[PDB]
Design an enzyme around this catalytic site. Sequence first.
Site, PDB file in Angstrom:
ATOM      1  N   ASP A   1     -73.021 -12.942 -25.655  1.00  0.00           N
ATOM      2  CA  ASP A   1     -73.077 -12.193 -26.851  1.00  0.00           C
ATOM      3  C   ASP A   1     -72.254 -12.676 -28.165  1.00  0.00           C
ATOM      4  O   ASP A   1     -71.356 -12.571 -28.325  1.00  0.00           O
ATOM      5  CB  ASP A   1     -72.238 -10.842 -26.230  1.00  0.00           C
ATOM      6  CG  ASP A   1     -72.274  -9.377 -26.931  1.00  0.00           C
ATOM      7  OD1 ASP A   1     -73.072  -9.842 -28.136  1.00  0.00           O
ATOM      8  OD2 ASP A   1     -71.863  -8.401 -26.723  1.00  0.00           O
ATOM      9  N   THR A   2     -73.127 -12.644 -29.152  1.00  0.00           N
ATOM     10  CA  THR A   2     -72.541 -13.091 -30.486  1.00  0.00           C
ATOM     11  C   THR A   2     -71.845 -11.957 -30.970  1.00  0.00           C
ATOM     12  O   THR A   2     -71.057 -12.093 -32.213  1.00  0.00           O
ATOM     13  CB  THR A   2     -73.832 -13.632 -31.310  1.00  0.00           C
ATOM     14  OG1 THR A   2     -74.782 -12.439 -31.489  1.00  0.00           O
ATOM     15  CG2 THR A   2     -74.569 -14.786 -30.623  1.00  0.00           C
ATOM     16  N   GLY A   3     -71.944 -10.678 -30.589  1.00  0.00           N
ATOM     17  CA  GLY A   3     -71.098  -9.534 -31.236  1.00  0.00           C
ATOM     18  C   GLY A   3     -70.058  -9.540 -30.688  1.00  0.00           C
ATOM     19  O   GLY A   3     -69.270  -8.518 -31.233  1.00  0.00           O
TER      20      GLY A   3
HETATM   21  C1  LIG Z   1     -62.795  -8.259 -29.009  1.00  0.00           C
HETATM   22  O1  LIG Z   1     -63.664  -8.350 -28.022  1.00  0.00           O
HETATM   23  C2  LIG Z   1     -64.580  -7.753 -27.880  1.00  0.00           C
HETATM   24  C3  LIG Z   1     -65.807  -7.843 -27.070  1.00  0.00           C
HETATM   25  C4  LIG Z   1     -66.895  -6.942 -27.072  1.00  0.00           C
HETATM   26  C5  LIG Z   1     -66.911  -5.713 -27.773  1.00  0.00           C
HETATM   27  S1  LIG Z   1     -68.210  -4.559 -27.829  1.00  0.00           S
HETATM   28  O2  LIG Z   1     -68.868  -4.819 -25.955  1.00  0.00           O
HETATM   29  O3  LIG Z   1     -67.757  -3.470 -27.672  1.00  0.00           O
HETATM   30  N1  LIG Z   1     -69.560  -4.880 -28.844  1.00  0.00           N
HETATM   31  C6  LIG Z   1     -68.740  -5.219 -30.001  1.00  0.00           C
HETATM   32  C7  LIG Z   1     -69.490  -4.575 -31.274  1.00  0.00           C
HETATM   33  C8  LIG Z   1     -70.601  -3.589 -30.880  1.00  0.00           C
HETATM   34  C9  LIG Z   1     -68.652  -3.923 -31.954  1.00  0.00           C
HETATM   35  C10 LIG Z   1     -70.235  -6.118 -28.498  1.00  0.00           C
HETATM   36  C11 LIG Z   1     -71.810  -5.712 -28.286  1.00  0.00           C
HETATM   37  O4  LIG Z   1     -72.589  -6.699 -27.821  1.00  0.00           O
HETATM   38  C12 LIG Z   1     -72.043  -4.492 -27.140  1.00  0.00           C
HETATM   39  C13 LIG Z   1     -71.786  -5.250 -25.668  1.00  0.00           C
HETATM   40  C14 LIG Z   1     -72.335  -4.379 -24.654  1.00  0.00           C
HETATM   41  C15 LIG Z   1     -71.598  -3.321 -23.936  1.00  0.00           C
HETATM   42  C16 LIG Z   1     -71.789  -2.369 -23.383  1.00  0.00           C
HETATM   43  C17 LIG Z   1     -73.024  -2.708 -22.427  1.00  0.00           C
HETATM   44  O5  LIG Z   1     -73.625  -2.012 -21.529  1.00  0.00           O
HETATM   45  C18 LIG Z   1     -73.871  -0.587 -22.095  1.00  0.00           C
HETATM   46  P1  LIG Z   1     -74.636   0.431 -20.342  1.00  0.00           P
HETATM   47  O6  LIG Z   1     -75.829  -0.271 -19.979  1.00  0.00           O
HETATM   48  O7  LIG Z   1     -74.770   1.784 -20.826  1.00  0.00           O
HETATM   49  O8  LIG Z   1     -73.519   0.555 -19.446  1.00  0.00           O
HETATM   50  C19 LIG Z   1     -74.114  -3.721 -23.040  1.00  0.00           C
HETATM   51  C20 LIG Z   1     -73.518  -4.583 -23.944  1.00  0.00           C
HETATM   52  N2  LIG Z   1     -73.354  -4.140 -27.372  1.00  0.00           N
HETATM   53  C21 LIG Z   1     -73.725  -2.619 -27.515  1.00  0.00           C
HETATM   54  O9  LIG Z   1     -72.757  -1.955 -27.649  1.00  0.00           O
HETATM   55  O10 LIG Z   1     -74.977  -2.679 -27.467  1.00  0.00           O
HETATM   56  C22 LIG Z   1     -75.405  -1.431 -27.750  1.00  0.00           C
HETATM   57  C23 LIG Z   1     -76.654  -1.491 -28.637  1.00  0.00           C
HETATM   58  O11 LIG Z   1     -77.751  -1.541 -28.084  1.00  0.00           O
HETATM   59  C24 LIG Z   1     -77.651  -1.170 -26.523  1.00  0.00           C
HETATM   60  O12 LIG Z   1     -77.634  -2.556 -25.838  1.00  0.00           O
HETATM   61  C25 LIG Z   1     -76.707  -2.368 -24.630  1.00  0.00           C
HETATM   62  C26 LIG Z   1     -75.762  -1.412 -25.128  1.00  0.00           C
HETATM   63  C27 LIG Z   1     -76.222  -0.715 -26.335  1.00  0.00           C
HETATM   64  C28 LIG Z   1     -65.665  -5.486 -28.587  1.00  0.00           C
HETATM   65  C29 LIG Z   1     -64.780  -6.435 -28.646  1.00  0.00           C
END
Ligand SMILES: COc1ccc(S(=O)(=O)N(CC(C)C)C[C@@H](O)[C@H](Cc2ccc(OCP(=O)(O)O)cc2)NC(=O)O[C@H]2CO[C@H]3OCC[C@H]32)cc1
EC number: 3.4.23.16
Lengths: 99, 99
Positions: B25-27
Amino acid sequence: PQITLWQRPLVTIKIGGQLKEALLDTGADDTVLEEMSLPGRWKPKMIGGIGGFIKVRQYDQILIEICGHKAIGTVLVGPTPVNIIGRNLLTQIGMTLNF
Amino acid sequence: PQITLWQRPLVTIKIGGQLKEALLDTGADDTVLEEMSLPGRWKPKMIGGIGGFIKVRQYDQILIEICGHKAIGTVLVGPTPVNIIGRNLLTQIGMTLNF
Ligand SMILES: COc1ccc(S(=O)(=O)N(CC(C)C)C[C@@H](O)[C@H](Cc2ccc(OCP(=O)(O)O)cc2)NC(=O)O[C@H]2CO[C@H]3OCC[C@H]32)cc1
């Protein structure tokens, strides 16, 4: 071009004729942007993040430029910490991960 | 090699003697894994994203094997819905975004 990851991969995007800053996010399936006005009708979508689920407005076939590259796709609008460009658009501009 | 973004860029990491599937994850500024025990001292931290914040335990100087690369970095452990490999580790293995 090649973008390293020592710093956040923040790029300039153009949508609706205005420049904004967005984060190239390989961990996001979709593109989510902060509150803004977009043309046409929108559909509801529930997306999950690290802290839980939120509601967004889904607009399709929206013109958006990312680092000068023209893309036309789905843009979700809602409460996000920052504008994020997900895989749906990253694939449109031929972006990949390399090591 | 090159990794397409057509699907979630998932990989298998090795940490603390356990195999886990994680998202390149680059984000993500930091690497975040689901609950697990790790040796050493930790500091409580709050991280936010879509859906809000989650509390995690910050571990530093953690060894993680990934893509054949042994890399060291900070690991955040908490109730994250998915295992995430953040930039702090991605840089160590020489991963870059290219277009
Ligand atoms: C300080 O270190 C940190 C590390 C990680 C984070 S994070 O994760 O908030 N986030 C940071 C940024 C969005 C502000 C990293 C993202 O790439 C997040 C990663 C992600 C999160 C949850 C997830 O599962 C969701 P589920 O399947 O509903 O359980 C997958 C990936 N992806 C995400 O928010 O994707 C959304 C945009 O389409 C969508 O793609 C999947 C999540 C839905 C913040 C801070």
